[PDB]
DNA sequence: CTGTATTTAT
DNA sequence: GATAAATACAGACCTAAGTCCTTGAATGCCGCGT
DNA sequence: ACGCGGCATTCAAGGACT
């Protein structure tokens, strides 16, 4: 069984509503950890990791290790039906067909349940290992999600040229063509627009348009984006949270000649 | 009266699979596929009113036991032809994760099939291949043509073929003693020739003779149900004389209601089936009821054309 | 091949003894090819194609304007197309699992539109795969792990005209970087046409009984039902070359 | 003659938007005590019964009954051409034809003169039945709106439970299954969020989601909806304007 | 070579969305005294005509005068690319390449460019005749824009009365009538709110309901817009900018 | 039907 | 390796017409957030 | 107030008609 009590169902609706719009189907995998979740993108091009640890939970209580297959359309559905203050709580019984959503309120005592039904997803769970970055950047999450849905529009690609020091996004497409260049600073008098920069070795990469875009969508998850490049490797997309993260692990375009 | 009883059709419908009197061999092969396990893809075609959607529904419920109102998904497709159903309804219900009995799966039931509009047909195509483990399609359709040949591929061609008279016989029987009718064998070998295999057709005509007049004698039946048009066409088409012919039309056809339209209507379709004329004979009657059609269509209905159709009938089979 | 099967399913059972049952599956996936040498019939195609899906690689080196020794290799887009159920999709699968590449199929009936098609086939055509890096891409036998096999299936039921995804996937395919590998079950068909010079067609036949025979026979042994080789021709012809429907 | 002012043109508006969408066709009857409105849906399975009052109108005058048919597609299109700054003035001749609306500001001197034919609308059968139905309950028309609209995303249909001091909404679908309870609880400091309940016989029926969401369009008129269950009778959804009201009576499915 | 800084990127963000869905290809003829822009649509109705002075920029600076064809949809596109406290920088080359299009923001830290590649359009005669209009009526745009799009449900036809101090604009409809009467007034405590009705001679004229919908889109520029009419000259539709016009010669029937 | 293509046989 | 059997398979796809239907693209209005 | 965000509604192209 599994009886996970949230303290706001809006943070659940945030999260939800962060990485719907790329992947449709997600394993939620619930360990005495918390919730750890992957799974492959339609296109096969980008993953979304998503773990979430007890300490988010009120309380957090787990039997057996058991497979969680959701729908993202369908959840985000059921969180649209609950208010903001409820607490929200899942339970499972055994051999889970069907997840019993627990909206509820201490103001009122009004109780809305909504049962889910759980879908079969099989798929690999295939292992993530960690490497090094030649490149570790973390930039405010607003500036982020502009600039990219800024150049979206000229071109379907986005290039992510690292100089010395500098950050520069070009865009070239049929209509038109843009570059923003970012200047490296650090502001004490506010932590949050800071920006800070780690560069092992320079790294030039472009990147899919619409991916990047779906992975601004996680903008309301954290103020701070932690971004991470290898030239040859999947460049880590991750999104800080007080108990986990929202990794993104998106592909390159092929750099012909 | 306020309330209303329910039909003879309905009430008496087959709910289990020893019921269904007809088309032995699928009955029992649909049987041993429920006892088993295992249900294969399958299209049923046939005629109306001789249990197609009772197999099917009664095949789905003996498999999935009490678990038909989950694992079971009742979709008229007529109603739900879009492609949107299969990407969204159809798509959610294969996917759905459900625990069921060691042989038994899913089973999707779509009835009149063959209205299903080309775009969802061919969406079906990869939805019915990569979920099969979990999910098993039915189709019931009155024409497999209209179902593409790939989903054709994938599924079991069961076919069916019309009643037989003994086995309506049968059925007609055991609603009579169940419910305690009185009846003649003339009426109850008029009700199985106007029914002409229909087994809906039969227990409908049993249902208003009973009510009607509360004897099932030839009498009533053929007052409550008129003789075959095509059989009245047929005999006034193959007739010796040609006044022969035009006393029955004005007779049968033209003094009792019937439509101009759908007199030479009829008699094409008579004269395209007849198999005792010879078929250069029965093209050129084609062509003259054509002709008579066309007229008919452009707006000159009336008993003088019909009648001058006949004659050139008769003109053609006296040399 | 009977007792190759019975010694195969004996393996599984010590594996799970150590999820769908098997007779829960039917008996076309069941018996389904896990290897080029048990498709019948249309051997040459499968060969054709095989050679094809190899090269490509040194014919993409060669920017492509080199038809080479079989001709496969002017060609960015190979089309397989034939009477339904004789195994294109199979064949396609088999070949890109065995040279390794990374499969990627889509339903062109299910995704038709434009918008749809347009955003993920493009953004699939010139990306890695992130399942193929992450599955264990530290071992150098397989080079292609990275790269793409969109397998195109259902290629018959896009949308037509302009406003249709069918002839913009003509101007689509000859821009790509990574094979393509196109089904579709009638090729003589008007909204197909601007496919014929952008794609390398593939005819699969009709397989004929012969060949059929050891497959079915094979079947028959294992599954405990008596089945007779002079019957096997009617069966294939009343079916009309389609093995999955026998 | 009728002469029927507004003092708030915005009123008619909101009236009529909250039956808009599930009627076209409506009788508006004027007599002496007031502007009675009823009309049926197409499918024929909702009842809309206006009663606005003498009270709405700033100056309203009626010489002699008349019925007024219009379409309210076009109506409706005729009152979005006013700003909410004005007085609305409905105008009929002698013999009903071509009612006259006029938008009027006296602030800034403008005159908006629209007119729209009448038709001849045969049902005018006019009859609703008072019955002692088996529960009354009043709740905000925001959160039984906000309910209707959350469960009706799950299925088709609704099915509305009233058990002792206990109000369900259950809604089983294809995707999931969902169910609200609430009960009836009174609030001294804002008598406004509170719920009350009145049950006699316990009560399980289900209604259509479409017809309801068309129902809860009402909710811009009253910021409390009543509702009034039986066994196998019309549910009675009303929303109480200032003179008068608006009552929708859905009739629930089949078992 | 053109150096154009404006002072705000809204204020030609607006000037574009005055008319979107009215022309798709348009030159911006580029001179030392403002620039000009003239577009026909494909009905022969209307004629689009759009200048704007050296006043209306911040900085304005071009030796060499330039032929600028743009598309207007990847105009706006461009457009959407900036934040609204930001300052628009249009500068080009003598080469009619590309149009170099720079953010510049009061931080600089933050630095956005653009590039719009120029298409070649046969461009059409300067329509500047200023024939006599029998009367002239200015009202705001945004009360304008709401009687347009209310009158043009009922019919796609919009008649407009002006005679005896007195406005009119009627819509006879299949489904009822529409009849808005408007007297001209001024009002001392706020200016914008005012009609200043000049009549020389009555004037009945139709016009279309999809143009007129099409002019009202301009309410965006300017919180009033002057309207003269003519009984045998096309009617001007003026909205006045800080220091330019935009303006709509609509051919009647 | 005639013409082209592919697989088993001589 | 060439030439026979033995056979599966491709040869080709138009313009109007009236009315219903479906599917995707383009369009509109209206609710939420800042 | 002011701008996006889905979602209802309107528009346009293709296919079928025994
Ligand atoms: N040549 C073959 N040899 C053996 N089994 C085959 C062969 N062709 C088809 N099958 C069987 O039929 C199943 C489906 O084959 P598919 O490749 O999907 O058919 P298809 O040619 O793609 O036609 P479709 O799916 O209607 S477009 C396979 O999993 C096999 O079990
Ligand atoms: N073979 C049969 N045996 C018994 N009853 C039958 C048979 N065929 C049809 N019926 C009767 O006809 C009614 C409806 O037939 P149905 O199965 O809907 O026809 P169809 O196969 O055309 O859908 C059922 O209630 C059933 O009682
Ligand atoms: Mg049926
Ligand atoms: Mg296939």
């Not at chain 1, 950047?137 to 010395?164: A, G, Y």
């Not at chain 2, 003879?8 to 699928?26: F, H």
């Not at chain 2, 003339?186 to 005509?205: H, V």
């Not at chain 3, 060949?211 to 009343?238: G, H, W």
Request: aromatic letters at 6%; charged letters at 25%; hydrophobic letters at 40%.
């Amino acid at each position: 069984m599994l009886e996970a009590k949230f303290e706001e169902a809006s943070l659940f609706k945030r999260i939800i509503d962060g990485f719907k719009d790329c992947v449709q189907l997600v394993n939620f995998q619930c360990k005495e950890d918390g919730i750890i979740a992957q799974a492959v993108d339609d296109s096969r091009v980008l993953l979304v990791s998503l773990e979430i640890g007890v300490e988010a939970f009120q309380e957090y209580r787990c039997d057996h290790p058991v497979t969680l297959g959701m729908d993202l359309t369908s959840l985000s559905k059921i969180l649209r039906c609950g208010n903001n203050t409820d607490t929200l709580t899942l339970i499972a019984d055994n051999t889970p067909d069907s997840i019993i959503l627990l909206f509820e309120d201490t103001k009122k005592d009004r109780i809305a349940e909504y049962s889910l039904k759980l879908m079969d997803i099989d798929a690999d769970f295939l292992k993530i290992e960690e490497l090094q970055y030649d490149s570790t950047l973390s930039l405010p999450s607003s500036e982020f999600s502009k600039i990219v849905r800024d150049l979206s529009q000229l071109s379907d690609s986005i290039n992510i040229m690292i100089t010395k020091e500098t950050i520069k996004f070009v865009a070239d497409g049929d209509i038109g063509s843009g570059s923003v260049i970012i200047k490296p600073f650090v502001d004490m008098e506010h932590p949050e627009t800071s920006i800070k920069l780690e560069m092992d070795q320079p790294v030039d990469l472009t990147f899919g348009a619409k991916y990047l875009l779906d992975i601004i969508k996680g903008s309301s998850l954290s103020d701070r984006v932690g971004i991470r490049l290898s030239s040859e490797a999947p460049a880590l997309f991750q999104f800080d949270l007080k108990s986990g993260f929202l990794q993104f692990f998106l592909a390159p375009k092929f750099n012909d000649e | 009266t306020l309330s209303l009883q329910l039909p003879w059709v309905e009430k008496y419908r087959p709910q289990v699979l020893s019921d269904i009197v007809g088309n032995k061999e699928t009955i029992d092969r649909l049987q041993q596929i429920a006892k088993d396990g295992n249900m294969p893809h399958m299209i049923i075609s046939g005629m109306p009113g001789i249990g197609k959607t009772t197999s099917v529904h009664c095949l789905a419920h003996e498999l999935l036991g009490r678990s038909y109102a989950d694992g079971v998904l009742e979709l008229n497709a007529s109603d739900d032809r879009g492609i949107d159903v299969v990407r969204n309804q159809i798509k959610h219900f294969a996917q759905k994760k459900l625990h069921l009995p060691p042989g038994k799966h899913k089973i999707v039931i779509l009835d009149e099939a063959d209205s299903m509009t080309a775009g969802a047909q061919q969406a079906l195509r990869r939805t019915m291949e990569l979920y099969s483990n979990s999910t098993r399609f039915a189709f019931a359709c009155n024409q497999s043509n209209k179902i593409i040949e790939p989903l054709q591929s994938r599924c079991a061609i069961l076919r069916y073929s019309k009643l037989s008279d003994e086995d309506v016989l049968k059925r007609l029987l055991q609603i009579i003693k169940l419910e305690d009718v009185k009846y003649t064998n003339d009426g109850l070998e008029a009700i199985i020739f106007t029914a002409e295999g229909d087994m809906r057709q039969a227990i409908n005509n049993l249902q208003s003779t009973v009510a009607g007049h509360g004897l099932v004698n030839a009498d009533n039946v053929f007052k409550i149900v008129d003789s075959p048009h095509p059989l009245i066409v047929k005999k006034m088409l193959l007739a010796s004389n040609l006044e022969d012919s035009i006393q029955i039309l004005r007779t049968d056809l033209w003094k009792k209601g019937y439509s101009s339209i759908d007199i030479v209507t009829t008699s094409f379709r008579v004269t395209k089936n007849l198999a005792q004329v010879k078929e250069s004979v029965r093209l050129e009657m084609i062509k003259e009821i054509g002709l008579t059609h066309m007229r008919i269509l452009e707006g000159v209905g009336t008993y003088l054309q019909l009648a001058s159709m006949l004659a050139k009938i008769h003109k053609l089979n006296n040399k | 091949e009977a007792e190759l099967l019975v010694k195969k399913e004996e393996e599984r059972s010590k594996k799970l003894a150590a999820v769908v049952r098997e007779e829960d599956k039917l008996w076309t996936v069941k018996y389904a090819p896990t290897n080029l040498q048990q498709v019948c019939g249309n051997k040459g195609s499968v060969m054709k194609l095989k050679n094809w899906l190899a090269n490509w690689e040194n014919s993409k080196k060669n920017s492509f304007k080199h038809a080479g020794k079989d001709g496969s290799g002017v060609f960015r887009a190979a089309m397989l197309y034939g009477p339904p159920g004789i195994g294109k999709t199979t064949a396609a699968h088999l070949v890109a699992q065995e040279l390794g590449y990374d499969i990627l199929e889509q339903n062109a009936s299910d995704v038709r539109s434009k918008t749809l098609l347009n955003a993920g086939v493009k953004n699939a055509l010139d990306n890695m795969s992130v399942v193929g890096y992450f599955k264990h891409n530290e071992e150098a036998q397989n080079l292609n792990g990275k790269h793409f096999v969109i397998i195109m299936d259902e290629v018959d039921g896009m949308s037509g005209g302009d406003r249709g995804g069918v002839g913009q996937l003509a101007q689509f395919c000859r821009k790509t970087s990574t094979p393509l590998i196109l089904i579709c079950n009638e090729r003589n068909l008007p909204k197909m046409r601007p496919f014929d010079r952008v794609c390398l067609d593939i005819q699969f036949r009709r397989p004929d009984a012969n060949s059929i025979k050891s497959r079915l026979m094979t079947i028959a042994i294992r599954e405990k039902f008596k089945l007779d080789p002079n019957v096997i021709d009617r069966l294939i012809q009343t079916t009309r070359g389609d093995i999955r429907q026998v």
